[PDB]
């Protein structure tokens, strides 16, 4: 049978793709409103000094999120 064997071509859930273990080190602190603006406005310019540019406009779909024309 094939569909149990083409899982090995579809999944690709490697250790290069995911970290081994993520642990929260502290309890989550609810942020305010304006710093979510003040984060995301500075988050977009990260890799913008390749791929990741289908996701850059996904990151630039985060751009419009609070000040555009929804």
């Amino acid at each position: 049978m094939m569909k149990g064997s083409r899982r090995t071509g579809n999944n690709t859930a490697t250790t290069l793709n995911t970290p081994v273990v993520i642990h929260a080190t502290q309890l989550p602190q609810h942020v305010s409103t304006d710093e979510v603006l003040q984060f995301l406005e500075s988050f977009i310019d990260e890799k913008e000094n390749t791929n990741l540019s289908s996701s850059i406009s996904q990151l630039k779909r985060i751009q419009r999120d609070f000040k555009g024309l929804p």
Partner: protein
């Protein structure tokens, strides 16, 4: 013998921080920053550029997705700092090569701005569509909730013209709408949100 084993069942499903109903708009606040610690690889092609080499392999495939270890939807990060394996701060940090491979593993702290819905929240999203089956929403331009019929107040009907909604106002209603949150889903690659329109 039914006390000492329940210390790890409830305490794990006791989800740690709730969502406060703040901002005096009625809405509950779900965007939240949590510091964490990862454990990632670092490929030898990035062994000169360890900043990009962790952002591109383990963080960039994690943004705008659900994560089962923090409970939220990862919106972003700032503060990716590799812990040095030399307990000397400095710029020439060192990590440990594995024995069987040329890949090195290391610890990293980061601050993930997760988006954290639970039941009992108060959320608002733009109405995407509406039928006599549900009302589809756009929570913050990207998330979809869908209040189905058996949780709608059953006063409110639906006129067909693909049609428009009939409330007690009798209005084809616009985007912005308040509801209350039922079981948030985790199942598909798409994060389904589910809610109720009872008040």
């Amino acid at each position: 013998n039914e006390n000492r084993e329940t210390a790890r069942f409830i305490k794990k499903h006791k989800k740690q921080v709730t969502n406060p109903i703040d901002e005096k708009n009625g809405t509950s606040n779900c965007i939240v920053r949590v510091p964490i610690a990862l454990y990632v690889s670092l490929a030898p092609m990035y062994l000169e550029n360890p900043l990009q080499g962790v952002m591109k392999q383990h963080l960039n495939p994690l943004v705008m997705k659900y994560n089962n270890k923090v409970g939220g939807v990862v919106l972003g990060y700032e503060g990716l700092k590799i812990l040095d394996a030399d307990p000397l701060d400095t710029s020439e940090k060192l990590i440990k090569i594995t024995p069987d491979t040329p890949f090195g593993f290391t610890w990293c702290h980061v601050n993930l701005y997760v988006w954290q819905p639970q039941v009992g929240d108060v959320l608002e999203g733009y109405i995407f569509i509406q039928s006599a089956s549900h009302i589809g929403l756009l929570i913050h331009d990207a998330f979809n909730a869908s209040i189905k019929k058996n949780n709608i107040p059953v006063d409110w009907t639906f006129v067909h013209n693909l049609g428009h909604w009939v409330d007690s106002n009798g209005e084809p209603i616009d985007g912005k709408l308040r509801f209350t949150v039922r079981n948030v889903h985790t199942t598909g690659r798409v994060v389904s949100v589910d809610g109720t329109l009872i008040s």
